[PDB]
């Protein structure tokens, strides 16, 4: 134990953590790996998502070289503050924090070679802009851009470990989402010239497909059961004017209320979604049904044969014209 | 210039004691306070509080900070506030108080050759203000902002204002939808307690509510519903279901409308001026339905009364609501 | 004058080890505590918690801070509180709390020639207040505030309340006002608890409260009472107006249904019925019964018009009375 | 005496390197851990998480902390915890957490002559509780709390539960109450996991819960069951009252739609049906069927008045039984 | 060599007083500022505020940092930023803000031989954006971002934009992220303001926005337009169908009432009507008029069946035209 205390003091004695390793001589290469402990709740309304990861970085620091009986140096966060570490920052980060209980969740391991292994646990909320045209049969891709803030590529460079495959791992238990399937992950790296230098930002893309089950129960079934209800009016006689009216007047507003209700939970986007269109025609079908009764009742006294006919015909054309719409609707957006 | 000032500061901090107030055992330090309100944030009658953004300032004399030099003032940043003595000023009715740390601690420290110190910091405060919203939405309130020393009673520390006691900023930036800033007054006093007799300093802000929102959100839909219920008078009793819908649905909406109105408001036990408006409107609507039931119970047997009731309702029901509206508005309008 | 106090402080802190409690190995440090509630924070029924803004004072004696000087006390800032030893008092039932910090930390340190220390601070604390809501909205609740040392059992540190003069618990008239509850009163207590890490002395401050019924009278009871009375107006119509009679019942039963769910959403998700729940239940029975009354009358109006018509005439007097008597017994039961 | 303890502390910390765990290169640091749940925090189904307030204790041996003195143990504050080495234990499934700090950090350090350390602290932790809601609201859910070291694999640090005389996991009787769940019990566990940075030993604390049906019986089931019977009241009316019969069906069919969406808005947006959803689904079928019954009856009332009238009489007894038969099987199925 | 830079840093910071601005007593510290909006954060109409994620850069010259070495610029971390003097810039209209901290504080310090300092940082800022919603939802809003020093007036520190006004503020094309607004453009400005604590130079960056009408077309306008059309279907029924005609009127008037409250709940509780309110207001008039029309015809249907029939056949052409013309005038106006 006493031997290692002197090793640490010898490495940190006269060690300036304010300067990156290789300043003015070599670029600091940082191989990075990532393990997603859990994929956090995705907020469509806020166009963001949360993620809890173990973010590891390894670089070579010659000032930390040493010869001893051990092969490395398992240490705590205590030493991480005393040495130099990369100033990595997540570009598209909204709000994030490093877990601190029981102690700062950090790990420092130093090798005789001088290579440093520096991993930490982070929960990050980042922006994930979405296009919701195909909602709720939609797929989304959420990025995670990160890189150095003060050191361009001429001084610090990032690269993925093990190659672009298996560089990023995700715990199967932690990718829990109520509304999305986590299809897969793809990594990337690109240099970008900025007015403060050309930095190398590395990205981790998370592709997602939305689950239709929830909206089937909350929106689609309530709408489909309301359109068929409006069509029951056709099976009544024009003599029951009030009854026929109650059917139409109520089902059109039920359809209106379902629209506003179904949209309140979604982001206030200024364009229609696949759910909106479905609701739109369902409103047309119910409104058409009520308009059908208004027509028969207006001509039932002058053209009772035509008015009566139009009732018998509506009992078959409306369901087919709606049933055929669902066939094309669900086939188009699920293809 | 730079080197000179550096030595003036180092020579004033070598034998200095941050943990000790000036005029300790000698006299009571006088603190001339001033305040500039940047904005008046949202009022939250639910938790009986309100937000406020201010530049708060304290100016005391510290003997230990006397320096002889050619320069007049030492315009410095916040890095010196922790290395000199600072009053323990705290706010007696604040639910939470926050400072501003971007880009730097939003504080300034100015020192004169005389030993006078100017220390002002940006603050945002959530002060508690109990609201007697009985005349709501036609209610008038005044809300305080008390602050005194936490540990130096009257003998050790004392406060007083300037003639620039308070200074308000651009009122358009202020996010006060339902209220309008009108008044601002200051008060000094000494409250007695067990730990001592502290001199407390309060600044009241006076706010008068606006009806515009509630007029469109509540009063109008209430005024139109009673009217709709009275259109039922211009129908025959043959169409019983028709006039039954009129009454049943209107009492239904005046009910939902009341709950929708109170949901967004604090859960006060007493009744407000609006609750009364909503209550009597419900009566105007409910009274219209029972009128039809009475007329219906008479139509079949005795069409004498069943006919003249509607004739008089079409005059009284509308005219009795309008007189009530004049009574209601004029009572609170002035 | 000023230089004298600077040297006094330096002499006291010179060689002072704040890692050790005063009297370690000789005497147990007794901590007399007083409390002043600056404001009783909003009570959250849904979260079963309450907030409170207090001035929490602790006084003990430190043999190492004995000094002789001109003035008898030492008015100091919070800066010294960190340099000396202070008790590690913690609130057992605390959920989340914080110490006020503006303009400076709301704390005060006063040291006497004797060595006695006075250490008071301003704290806003949200603590758990488990509630039994059987009598809701006519319920009374008692919210505790347990606190004590975390690392020092009774063998090392002990807490005690102050004498009567310095009231153990005080509550500012400015702060206790609550929109939904009355703060009846407060009672203190002290008790030892044997734990696997020692026997600690926890001190408790209980705050008893009864809910204000005004809000629910306006939001739930009146809508329910007026909806049952509305349903009974159906009796004043003829059976010939079948649709009309139906509109009364069908609408009022759902009006009562909606009033339930609406009244049911805002309250804590407790899995047992409250006094309000039963009230809503009976109003639903009376409204549903009224609609069922017409369905029976309309079913026998063709075969027994004399019986069908007469029961409509009695339903007008049995329903209101039977409901009026229900309200009389209901409101009398839960008010006493 | 006080000066004696000052020298003891200085002797232990003199030349003490807290950057190195005890036994580096000599022995693996074994950390026996105990836990006491001061309160089991609110469970958030929508957020799939739960809160918990625990006293988390760890005990290990540090040779460098060997001292010889009059007192056997050393009751200390958090000040010494920062100066010595402590395990870097972390909760894997943590969402957001914090250690209570008022008035001082809620921490306790006790050192015995042997060198054994007792290190316990108070923690409020929000952790993930993945839930399966197929049997909702009659389901059982288990919330884990897996924890272990972050930088020291099993080859350097090992965790183990308290073998005897202390139940490894304790739950305060005062804190365990929950508005929506019963806390059935707790089960502990230990497991090695091979990772690219070593094989760590994570220790698990499972908290098993079964949901309380009381809230949903009144909020969803009764409103649904009372709405289905309402739709069946239509059978007691004449076919001539088409509008009346229509008002019944259209109104109850939409009421059932509203109850569905309403009951699901408060729940997590899961993409699968629950036992409540199915219950609502069939209840929608029964009401829609009732309206469908009148639509059929009303269509043949002129051509087959004997059949139309006849089916109205059997529908009055088959529908209630056919719904009552569903409830018998439904409630028996999920409640056994 | 690394050791060479270690001595350079120590020599510069040795005896360095960060409490004093560079050029104190000789020259005013000029601070050239640049800004890059990494993303334009959500705008909260209810709160009259907006969020923004920027890289905020400031550059000034400090003679005390003049150094001679191998590399002519010094790429450094935040560690040194606290040890030297930096401007105390603060955003006046700031509500609440913070500097990103992961993995390390998002800050950058670069020093040159000349002594020029480059100090940039990443900030997420929530600031006040006072709005006038008369033309809501067809409105344009401008959100400011005033910033400047807190303790140094123009006599001590002065701010200026880089490379003139042009290109001083940039916005990432990926970062222009608003669901409800278009980010038209940005314009900068500078102005001196005399205050009781000195004459400071505040620099402002205005962000102009035009609201997107798509969301409200689906949530408010179409429900309103289709509900008025629904009410007019009543004209195509006979007065004999009193209950039916009543059901139309009774239902559409309350539907329109409900839509107002619904549409109004999401908006700020402003005490004045918006373009949406008026649109809803007339749609309520159109539906209520239709119900009143039936009440009139049904009142005279027996006495003047020719006139009662005439007003029905007339409502079928006058109501749609008067509403269609209103939308033509309404939508054409804005
Ligand atoms: C014919 C015209 C009828 C008049 C218009 C009717 C207006 C009332 C519609 C209510 O619909 C609900 O509104 C909630 C609040 O907007 C939504 O809550 C959901 O979404 C909200 C916003 O994202 C969240 O605050 C909630 O927690 C979440 O449950 C919910 O999904 C939606 O069904
Ligand atoms: C037939 C019997 C009666 C049945 C009644 C059923 C319907 C109840 C009416 C609901 O009305 C809404 O309630 C919200 C609360 O639920 C309010 O939200 C407002 O106030 C809330 C609480 O202050 C905030 O959370 C919201 O953000 C804010 O929009 C909103 O203004 C109000 O219009
Ligand atoms: C179909 C039936 C719909 C009933 C709607 O009734 C409303 O539901 C809200 C559901 O949110 C309640 O909100 C109240 O209670 C909620 C539950 O805590 C809070 O979130 C709200 O802010 C508060 O206004 C509100 O009182 C209640 O009238
Ligand atoms: C007939 C055709 C039209 C379909 C029906 C339209 C009306 C929709 C019913 C709304 O019912 C309410 O929805 C809230 C959410 O929107 C729920 O709030 C609950 O759940 C929310 C989200 O979980 C929380 O934010 C609230 O605080 C909590 O009270 C609340 O329980 C529920 O009664
Ligand atoms: C004529 C008969 C009587 C009618 C009385 C009113 C009936 C009920 C209307 C409720 O309308 C909803 O209210 C929500 C709560 O106020 C709004 O939520 C929206 O706005 C709220 C406040 O900004 C947010 O809290 C929510 O998350 C957001 O979804 C929502 O948009 C709105 O459609
Ligand atoms: C994958 C990567 C190198 C970026 O990860 C770490 O470097 C890291 N950092 C911390 N930990 C890890 C390892 C690696 C595999 C996942 N993993 C863990 O989950 C874990 C565990 Br089970 C217990 C204690 C520490 C860690
Ligand atoms: C007069 C008073 C003591 C109440 O003054 C402050 O409290 C204060 N403290 C800081 N600042 C101010 C002055 C006051 C007038 C407006 N005003 C400012 O807004 C401001 C500005 Br523009 C830039 C830099 C500092 C300040
Ligand atoms: C009673 C106790 C020792 C527990 O006292 C405090 O803890 C305390 N701490 C600070 N202050 C107080 C006293 C106590 C009585 C009311 N009271 C105050 O409210 C107050 C006031 Br008005 C101004 C300045 C300081 C205080
Ligand atoms: C059980 C366990 C070892 C895991 O617990 C602690 O080690 C611990 N840590 C702190 N405290 C305790 C004891 C143990 C029993 C519960 N218990 C307490 O509740 C308590 C009390 Br009443 C007052 C002061 C400190 C504590
Ligand atoms: C434009 C301005 C001077 C106000 O900006 C900076 O001074 C700054 N500050 C930090 N960074 C930058 C550059 C400039 C362009 C945007 N930009 C970046 O996004 C970026 C990146 Br990709 C990686 C590392 C650092 C930065
Ligand atoms: C970006 O810079 C790195 C480091 O010089 C280099 O390896 C890489 O090839 C460059 N571009 C791309 C597209 O990889
Ligand atoms: C400062 O000025 C006062 C008054 O002239 C004088 O008494 C004192 O000696 C001066 N101090 C110094 C350091 O010059
Ligand atoms: C209060 O404010 C007024 C107006 O500025 C001022 O004249 C008066 O002196 C102030 N009084 C106190 C006690 O501050
Ligand atoms: C608490 O401890 C003291 C000292 O041992 C004892 O006198 C007192 O009776 C104890 N109180 C309880 C409730 O056990
Ligand atoms: C983990 O590894 C250690 C060392 O081999 C062993 O003693 C222990 O039994 C293992 N635990 C499990 C759960 O496999």
What domains are there in chain B, each with its CATH number? 2-209 (2.70.170.10), 212-333 (1.20.58.390)
Domain with CATH 2.70.170.10 in chain C: 2-211
The closest alpha carbon to C147, from C127, C165, C175, belongs to C127
Q: Give the C-alpha separation, C201 to C223, whole Å.
A: 51
Query: According to the entry, how was the structure determined?
Result: X-ray
Cβ distance of D230 and C253 shorter than 8 Å: yes
CA distances from B222 to B108, B214, D174 (A): 54, 11, 49
Domain with CATH 1.20.58.390 in chain C: 214-335
CA distances from C212 to B271, C135, C179, C278, D113 (A): 13, 12, 8, 19, 59
Q: Taking CB atoms and an 8 Å cutoff, what residues of chain B touch E269? A: 177-178, 213, 217
E127 close to E94: Cβ distance less than 8 angstroms: yes
CATH class of domain segment(s) D215-334: mainly alpha
Local structure of residue A220 (DSSP, 8 states): I
CATH class of domain segment(s) C214-335: mainly alpha
Of chain E, the end-to-end C-alpha distance in Å amounts to 68
Cα–chain-centroid distance for residue B70? 48
What is the residue-wise DSSP string for B298-324? HHTT-HHHHHHHHHHHHHHHHHHHHHH
Q: Going by C-beta distance under 8 Å and a sequence separation of 6 or more, which residues neighbour residue A221?
A: none
A24 close to E71: Cβ distance less than 8 angstroms: yes
B333 close to B319: Cβ distance less than 8 angstroms: no
- Whether omega before E103 lies within 30 degrees of 0, making that bond cis, reads yes
Across B311-327, b (16+ Cβ under 10 Å) vs e yields: eebeeebeeebeebeee
A140 close to A184: Cβ distance less than 8 angstroms: no
| Torsion angle (degrees, nearest 10) of CA E109, E112, E116, E118 | -20
A49 close to A125: Cβ distance less than 8 angstroms: yes
Query: What are the beta bridge partners of residue C29?
Result: C157
* Helix boundaries (H) for A149-272: 213-215, 221-231, 241-264
Ligand 2: which residue has its CA nearest to atom 28? B264
Q: Going by C-beta distance under 8 Å and a sequence separation of 6 or more, which residues neighbour residue D123?
A: A101, A102, D53, D54, D55, D56, D97, D98, D99, D100
Q: Taking CB atoms and an 8 Å cutoff, what residues of chain A touch D196? A: 33, 35
Closest ligand (CA of C155): 14
CATH class of domain segment(s) A213-333: mainly alpha
Residues lining ligand 8, CB < 6 A? B 92, 148, 150, 191, 193-195, 198; C 34-36, 38, 55, 57, 120
Cβ distance of B300 and C3 shorter than 8 Å: no
Q: Going by C-beta distance under 8 Å and a sequence separation of 6 or more, which residues neighbour residue E104?
A: A85, A86, A87, A88, A89, A149, E77, E78
**C-alpha triplet A18, A21, A27: angle, nearest 5°:** 125
Q: Give the C-alpha separation, D327 to E305, whole Å.
A: 57
Q: Superfamily assignment of E215-333 in CATH? A: Neurotransmitter-gated ion-channel transmembrane domain (1.20.58.390)
Q: Taking CB atoms and an 8 Å cutoff, what residues of chain A touch E241? A: 241-242, 245
Of chain C, the end-to-end C-alpha distance in Å amounts to 66
Rounded to 5 degrees, what are φ and ψ at A281? Answer: -70, -40
Radius of gyration of chain D (CA): 32
The closest alpha carbon to B104, from E190, E121, A196, belongs to E121
E177 close to E40: Cβ distance less than 8 angstroms: yes
Tokens in use for D4?
């004696």
The closest alpha carbon to D55, from D182, D164, D154, D162, belongs to D162
Q: Give the C-alpha separation, C276 to C223, whole Å.
A: 13
Residue with tokens 């495959």: A165
CA distances from C301 to C39, C97, C291, D140 (A): 66, 69, 15, 53
- Reduced to 3 states (helix: H, G, I; strand: E, B; else coil), residue D177 is coil
How many CB atoms are closer than 10 A to CB C310? 12
Q: Give the C-alpha separation, B168 to C321, whole Å.
A: 62
3-state SS, C55-79, equals: EEEEEEECHHHCCCCCCCEEEECHH
Residue with tokens 């009662």: E308
CA distances from E176 to C80, E19, E168 (A): 51, 39, 17
Q: Give the C-alpha separation, D67 to D69, whole Å.
A: 6
Angle between helix B220-231 and helix B240-263 axes, rounded to 10 deg: 170
Radius of gyration of chain B (CA): 32
Cβ distance of B271 and C218 shorter than 8 Å: yes
Local structure of residue C156 (DSSP, 8 states): T
Query: What are the beta bridge partners of residue D108?
Result: D120
- Reduced to 3 states (helix: H, G, I; strand: E, B; else coil), residue B332 is helix
Pairing mode of beta strands B116-128, B49-61: antiparallel
State which ligand 3 atom lies nearest to the alpha carbon of B263. Answer: 24
Q: Give the C-alpha separation, C238 to B297, whole Å.
A: 7
Domain with CATH 1.20.58.390 in chain D: 215-334
B158 close to B199: Cβ distance less than 8 angstroms: yes
Burial class (CB in 10 A: 0-12, 13-18, 19+), C9: buried
Give the side-chain half-sphere CA count within 13 A for B72: 0
The closest alpha carbon to C47, from C208, C267, C271, belongs to C267
Radius of gyration of chain E (CA): 32
**Closest chain C residue by Cα to residue D1:** C25
Pairing mode of beta strands A139-142, A197-210: antiparallel
Q: Give the C-alpha separation, D116 to B38, whole Å.
A: 58
**Closest chain B residue by Cα to residue C224:** B255
Angle between helix C305-335 and helix C222-232 axes, rounded to 10 deg: 170
The closest alpha carbon to B36, from B168, B175, B182, B188, belongs to B168
Local structure of residue D217 (DSSP, 8 states): I
Q: Give the C-alpha separation, E151 to E146, whole Å.
A: 16
Angle between helix E242-265 and helix B220-231 axes, rounded to 10 deg: 180
Q: Give the C-alpha separation, E214 to E209, whole Å.
A: 15
D291 close to D249: Cβ distance less than 8 angstroms: yes
Rounded to 5 degrees, what are φ and ψ at C52? Answer: -155, 135
How many CB atoms are closer than 10 A to CB C217? 14
| Torsion angle (degrees, nearest 10) of CA E311, E315, E318, E319 | 150
Local structure of residue E276 (DSSP, 8 states): H
Q: Give the C-alpha separation, E187 to E168, whole Å.
A: 9
Q: Give the C-alpha separation, B238 to B296, whole Å.
A: 9
Question: H-helix or E-strand containing A145?
Answer: strand A145-148
Q: Give the C-alpha separation, A233 to E271, whole Å.
A: 44
Q: Give the C-alpha separation, B110 to E160, whole Å.
A: 25
Q: Give the C-alpha separation, B243 to A24, whole Å.
A: 91
Establish, for the pair of chains C and D, how many residue pairs have beta carbons separated by less than 8 Å: 168
**What CATH number belongs to D2-212?**
2.70.170.10
Burial class (CB in 10 A: 0-12, 13-18, 19+), C14: exposed
To test the contact with chain D by mutation, choose from A178, A213, A239, A293 the residue with the greatest count of D C-beta atoms within 10 A, namely: A178
Q: Give the C-alpha separation, A145 to A91, whole Å.
A: 5
Of chain B, the end-to-end C-alpha distance in Å amounts to 64
User: Backbone dihedral region of E15: left (phi > 0), alpha (psi from -120 to 50 degrees) or beta?
Assistant: left
Give the side-chain half-sphere CA count within 13 A for B305: 11
Rounded to 5 degrees, what are φ and ψ at A280? Answer: -60, -50
Q: Going by C-beta distance under 8 Å and a sequence separation of 6 or more, which residues neighbour residue B84?
A: B13, B16, B18, B62, B65, B109, B117
B168 close to B181: Cβ distance less than 8 angstroms: yes
The structure was resolved to a resolution in Å of 2.4
A4 close to D16: Cβ distance less than 8 angstroms: no
- Reduced to 3 states (helix: H, G, I; strand: E, B; else coil), residue A263 is helix
Rounded to 5 degrees, what are φ and ψ at D224? Answer: -70, -45
The closest alpha carbon to D50, from D135, D136, D137, D141, belongs to D141
CATH of C2-211, one of 3.40.1050.10, 2.60.40.10, 2.70.170.10, 3.40.50.300: 2.70.170.10
Q: Going by C-beta distance under 8 Å and a sequence separation of 6 or more, which residues neighbour residue C60?
A: C22, C29, C30, C31, C32, C87, C116, C117, C119
Tokens in use for C192?
């030892």
Q: Superfamily assignment of A2-210 in CATH? A: Neurotransmitter-gated ion-channel ligand-binding domain (2.70.170.10)
- Reduced to 3 states (helix: H, G, I; strand: E, B; else coil), residue E195 is strand
CA distance, residue E119 to nearest chain B CA (Å): 11
Local structure of residue B262 (DSSP, 8 states): H
Q: Taking CB atoms and an 8 Å cutoff, what residues of chain B touch E47? A: 42, 175
A76 close to A7: Cβ distance less than 8 angstroms: no
CA distance, residue C102 to nearest chain B CA (Å): 6
* Helix boundaries (H) for E143-274: 214-216, 222-232, 242-265
What is the residue-wise DSSP string for E85-106? ----EEETTEEEEEE--SBS-S
Q: Give the C-alpha separation, A179 to A214, whole Å.
A: 8
- Reduced to 3 states (helix: H, G, I; strand: E, B; else coil), residue A45 is coil
E287 close to E252: Cβ distance less than 8 angstroms: yes
* Helix boundaries (H) for chain E: 2-13, 214-216, 222-232, 242-265, 275-300, 305-333
Local structure of residue C89 (DSSP, 8 states): E
Query: What are the beta bridge partners of residue B186?
Result: B203
Rounded to 5 degrees, what are φ and ψ at D269? Answer: -75, 65
């Amino acid at each position: 134990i006493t031997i290692f205390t002197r090793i640490l003091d010898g490495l940190l004695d006269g060690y300036d953590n304010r300067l990156r390793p290789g300043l003015g001589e070599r670029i600091t290469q940082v191989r990075t790996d990532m393990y997603v402990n859990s994929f956090g709740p995705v907020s469509d309304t806020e166009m963001e998502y949360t993620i809890d990861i173990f973010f590891a970085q390894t670089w070579k620091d010659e000032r930390l070289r040493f010869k001893g009986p051990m092969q490395r140096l398992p240490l705590d966060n205590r030493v991480a503050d005393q040495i130099w570490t990369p100033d990595t920052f997540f570009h598209n980060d909204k709000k994030s924090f490093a877990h601190g209980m029981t102690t700062p969740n950090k790990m420092l391991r130093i090798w005789n070679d001088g290579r440093v292994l520096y991993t930490m646990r982070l929960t990050i909320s980042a922006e994930c802009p979405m296009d919701l045209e195909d909602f709720p049969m939609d797929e989304q891709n959420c990025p995670l851009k990160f890189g150095s803030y003060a050191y361009p590529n001429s001084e610090v460079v990032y690269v993925w470990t093990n190659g672009s495959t298996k560089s990023v791992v995700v715990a199967e238990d932690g990718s829990r989402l109520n509304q999305y399937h986590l299809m897969g992950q793809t990594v990337g790296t690109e240099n970008i010239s900025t007015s403060t230098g050309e930095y190398t930002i590395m990205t981790a893309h998370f592709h997602l497909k939305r689950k239709i089950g929830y909206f089937v129960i909350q929106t689609y079934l309530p709408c489909i059961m309301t359109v068929i209800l409006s069509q029951v009016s056709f099976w009544l006689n024009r003599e029951s004017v009030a009854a026929r009216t109650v059917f139409g007047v109520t089902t059109v507003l039920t359809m209106t209320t379902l629209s506003i209700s179904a949209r309140n939970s979604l982001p206030k986007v200024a364009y229609a979604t696949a759910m909106d269109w479905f609701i739109a025609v369902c409103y047309a079908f119910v409104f058409s049904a009520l308009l059908e009764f208004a027509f028969v009742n207006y001509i039932t006294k002058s053209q009772p044969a035509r008015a009566a006919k139009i009732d018998k015909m509506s009992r078959i054309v409306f369901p087919i014209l709606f049933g055929t719409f669902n066939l094309v609707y669900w086939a188009t957006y699920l293809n | 210039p730079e080197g000179d000032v550096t030595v003036i500061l180092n020579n004033l901090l070598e034998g200095y004691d941050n943990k000790l107030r000036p005029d300790i055992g000698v006299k009571p330090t006088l603190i001339h306070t001033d305040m500039y309100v940047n904005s008046i944030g949202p009022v939250n009658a639910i938790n009986m509080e309100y937000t406020i953004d201010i530049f708060f300032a304290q100016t005391w004399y510290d003997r230990r900070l006397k320096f002889n030099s050619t320069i007049k003032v030492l315009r410095l940043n916040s890095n010196m506030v922790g290395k000199i003595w600072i009053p323990d000023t705290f706010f007696r009715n604040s639910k939470k108080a926050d400072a501003h740390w971007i880009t730097t601690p939003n504080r300034m420290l100015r020192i004169w050759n005389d030993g006078r110190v100017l220390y002002t910091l940006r603050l945002t405060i959530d002060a508690e203000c109990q609201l007697q919203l009985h005349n709501f939405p036609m209610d008038e309130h005044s809300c305080p902002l008390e602050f005194s020393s936490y540990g130096y009673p009257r003998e050790e520390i004392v406060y007083q204002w300037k003639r620039s006691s308070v200074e308000v900023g651009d009122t358009r930036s202020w996010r006060l939808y339902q209220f309008s800033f009108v008044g601002l007054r200051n008060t000094t006093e000494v409250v007695k307690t067990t730990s001592g007799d502290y001199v407390v300093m309060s600044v009241y802000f006076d706010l008068s509510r606006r009806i515009g929102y509630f007029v469109i959100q509540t009063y109008l839909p209430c005024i139109m519903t009673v009217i709709l219920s009275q259109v039922s008078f211009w129908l025959n009793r043959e169409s019983v279901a028709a006039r039954t819908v009129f009454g049943v649905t209107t009492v239904l909406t005046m009910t939902t409308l009341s709950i929708s109105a109170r949901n967004s408001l604090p859960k006060v036990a007493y009744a407000t001026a609006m609750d009364w408006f909503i209550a009597v409107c419900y009566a105007f609507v409910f009274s219209a339905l029972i009128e039809f039931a009475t007329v219906n119970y008479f139509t079949k047997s005795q069409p004498a009364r069943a006919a003249k009731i509607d004739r008089l309702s079409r005059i009284a029901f509308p005219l009795l609501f309008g007189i009530f509206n004049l009574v209601y508005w004029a009572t609170y309008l002035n």
